[PDB]
Amino acid sequence: VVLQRRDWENPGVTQLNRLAAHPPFASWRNSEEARTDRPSQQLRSLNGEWRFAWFPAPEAVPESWLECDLPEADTVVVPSNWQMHGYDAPIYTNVTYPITVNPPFVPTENPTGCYSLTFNVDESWLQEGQTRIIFDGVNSAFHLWCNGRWVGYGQDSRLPSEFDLSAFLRAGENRLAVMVLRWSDGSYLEDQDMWRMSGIFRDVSLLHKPTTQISDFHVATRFNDDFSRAVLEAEVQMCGELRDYLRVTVSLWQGETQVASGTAPFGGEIIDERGGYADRVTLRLNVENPKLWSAEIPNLYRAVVELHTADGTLIEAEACDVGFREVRIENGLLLLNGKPLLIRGVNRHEHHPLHGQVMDEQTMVQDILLMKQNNFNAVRCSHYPNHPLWYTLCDRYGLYVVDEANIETHGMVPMNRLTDDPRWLPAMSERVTRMVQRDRNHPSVIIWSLGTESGHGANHDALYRWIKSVDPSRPVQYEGGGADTTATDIICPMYARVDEDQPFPAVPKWSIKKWLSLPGETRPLILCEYAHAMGNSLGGFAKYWQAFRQYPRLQGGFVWDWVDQSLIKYDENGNPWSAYGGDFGDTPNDRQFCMNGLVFADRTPHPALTEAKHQQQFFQFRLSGQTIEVTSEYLFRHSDNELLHWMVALDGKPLASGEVPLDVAPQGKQLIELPELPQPESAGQLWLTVRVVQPNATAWSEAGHISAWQQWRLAENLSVTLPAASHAIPHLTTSEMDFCIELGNKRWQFNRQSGFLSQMWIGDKKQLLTPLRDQFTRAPLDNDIGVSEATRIDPNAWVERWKAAGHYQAEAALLQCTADTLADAVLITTAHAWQHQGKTLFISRKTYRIDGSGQMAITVDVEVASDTPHPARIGLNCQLAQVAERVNWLGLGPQENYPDRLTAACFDRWDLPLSDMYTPYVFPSENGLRCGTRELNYGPHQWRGDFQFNISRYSQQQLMETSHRHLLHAEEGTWLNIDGFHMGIGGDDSWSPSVSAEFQLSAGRYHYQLVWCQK
Amino acid sequence: GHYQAEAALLQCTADTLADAVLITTAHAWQHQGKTLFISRKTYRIDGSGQMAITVDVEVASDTPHPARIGLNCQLAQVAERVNWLGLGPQENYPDRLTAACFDRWDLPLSDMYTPYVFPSENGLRCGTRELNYGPHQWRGDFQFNISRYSQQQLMETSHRHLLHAEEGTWLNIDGFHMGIGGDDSWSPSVSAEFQLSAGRYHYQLVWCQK
Ligand SMILES: O=C1O[C@H](CO)[C@H](O)[C@H](O)[C@H]1O
Ligand SMILES: [Mg+2]
Ligand SMILES: [Mg+2]
Ligand SMILES: [Mg+2]
Ligand code: NA
């Protein structure tokens, strides 16, 4: 029957004998345990060691397994993904389905996971009441047997499947048999851009309920106009035999104080001609001056639901955390408790580099802490309902949650092929309805989502309306079919740009500013995905936040995304390395496109995270003369854990500093008058830095946490006092092959064949391993390569334009090399043309002036042909002989920063170990740049000017040739790249050119100057 | 003190090279102890008769962004025609140059002055690679205006009919020039991208006879 029915190739059958979905139950038999959320004896975990066997298809599974353990089976930890234990390969594919597109059919070669457990059940559990098993997550489908008898079937990998085992179990030893199919008709609705895995990957538990039971409960909170009064409404449903002596009590607690309570027998109000629900009751509780829930202040009450007899005998209790909050869209704005939200959000997949898609509390808490510490207030459950603990943690720590149905059909052609088909409506409906039934009592969930990338079908419209009707308390959004369909309350585009339109046929991505005011449009706009954080990215991030702040109806967005989906593999010595698509022999695959995070898989931050933190700051600053104006972007809280630190420095040297407590109302302003600053003696630029510090520890941060910062240039005193001229004179030595400059025992060698500084000497010590040459190229970033799929060679991508123009192949042709003696210096003049097959790309004209103080002043003027693609950089490079420990600079830092991603960086004197000047992006590229640098120090060298630089043991050539960071080898000496100019990194998306015009090197003529000397 | 600032000489040296003479200068413009601007220049005169001028200007970050960064002189020549390779033929400024076309233009000198009834800076042409006036040629990438009226006369005079042709021809060659604005005329209306706020400025010019 089981093999005959092939229920996993039938979208009409998504379950057999599965129990109704409901909010989290524990069946407490002690009311205080319910109140305080203590563990319940009636809720047992079946997590731990199970037996597992892998088969190539369900037809390969022996019958004996239903009744007896397989001797060849292994013992494994559950929850797990079986790919993580090495039974088969995890597959990374983005859009293209991992199986042949032939709905509802799946491959006959269908990897099958045979899980089994021998466990004890106590007689007391079977003598009365109901014993159910709960599978929180099984990917992608499964049949269940108990003691050899078939129980049921379940689909949807991301919601719990529950089955009544009361009639199947015996006192003492029992055996479960679970056949998990990797592929099913459900897989057609699970085409998320992530690793494709399978198995029992979330918790398994047993729950005992009395026969007469709480089967469901819904909690609503409604408010008067000023939120000074609320009504808590609790609808409660029972199963079992109705009796007149039955009662429901709902009590509401704040800490240990009961603030409200109501008791009633069952029997709802009249609903229609046939009466009412005899098996339901609604309790209404008045609450004066409720403490309101937000991500700012996550105030929680506790609601306890008791099923009992009239004379006071408890049957059972259930409970939940209640957050008093109202979510509504009014006049085109998303409001929480009457105030317009600004969503500082991120998309977060459930991913662990070791455990795959198994989630644990420690990782969840770590993510939330890092999110809040980096000024995020919101998370999107991309693209499925999460592990149930996630919502509990969001309720308590305070994050706004978009809860999303497990529906994505991206690989369909067209994208709505299934979602417009009424045959797929039952399967889609269960993915929506069972999510709502499970999560509707969590205050952190403020918005429902119908899924992602499934086009726009009639099924979406039906399900949009179902939610609107069943739960009016939360807006519904959905991006498919152009982000502004009739199935969404919120314009929710993915990677729509700030100012630039992308007018795709049918589904255009308008400039977000333009989108709001399209004829007849009135809704708020919140990007469900933006600022694609793939590799060296988040260029232009500040542009989004300026617009978010300027436009009331631009209420923010969710960054794509939180965490790199890299996996751990090991070399022959057992050293772990980060793997991406293809590294497991998985094919076809989409390579590094699984790594889009602000953090590495182990939760180490990418440089881009600090840019996000800074732009998402909750305090805004303006300076006018002596006065700092601080504006609060909090909606609900006063600044009661904040003080403003200010410091004034002259070129990194502290001049004055001080503290002022912040006392700003939500949305308010505070004016801070700085004292008289003593005028500095020496020349240079004064810089003002302010930082907002939290003196007191919180649930989410340590004492001293910095939440906000800003910098201004103050007075500048230009250097006019010409330095006292040294008495020494450099000498020019000319041969046919070289111009050599000598000062004391210092030597500068210029090759006359090549026209470059080929060597420098301090006495007998060599300074260079490679000559100092112009560089116009970078090892391509993921945004430069610009493909979302591995098999696309895209002529429009920046890298392809550079390659085809001959940028990486360009050979230097010497046009001029002369040497002149001056009164106090030697002057070397050079010109070079870079050409590709007859075409001049760039011309570089230089002068090197070596004076008696041993300073080499390099002047560089570059012409760039207007018809060549704008170069990635305009600078110089060389391999230095020296390897030093520290890197010291006056400029923007301390972290990596690029022209379109440097707002978070501060101007000061920074000093880091050399290793910190390299960013270990799993896919290697140009990295570690620091901009607006006036002085750089390394070993015996000092460079002064106004440049961008990076410095590392890896050449641009190695970086562009190597696919994985673990494969990189330190080279002899140190590679230095000093740029007059560097192109933006972009990142609005990573599959089309995304570097904004103002960050492209398009000026045609460029000038920069450097001084190289010994320090 | 932008209109009051006097040039103070910091450096003036001359070196003889293989086929050229190199003059190096440095000036600071100060107002009541405050250094507004620093100009550093080299003039390279070679055997072909060309003078290559390299100009590097520092602008104090806390002084109001300057109206222009350039050079001026009164030429002795009064010639009938002005010939340039650049944007034109009409007056155009950095934030008002979209209508202008790049080409070889040739106009009578009088067309290089715009007779605004209230006199001001006028007649600029941008994106110019070559300018010809009498025996003179200037090459580079610059903005220029050229007329019988000095900037001083224009700012001192209230009505265009009160202007008088001065002895030679005033030439203003700018490396950089501020936007003119106009979103309104009663508050600062020049957009940030057209203000001269970069702090350090570089331009180069070749002056020769044709
Ligand atoms: O539009 C999207 O872009 C991302 C690219 O990495 C990723 O595929 C998301 O799941 C998808 O919603
Ligand atoms: Mg099915
Ligand atoms: Mg997708
Ligand atoms: Mg715990
Ligand atoms: Na806004």
Ligand code: NA
């Ligand atoms: Na991705």
Ligand code: NA
């Ligand atoms: Na405070």
Ligand code: NA
């Ligand atoms: Na690479």
Ligand code: NA
């Ligand atoms: Na005037």
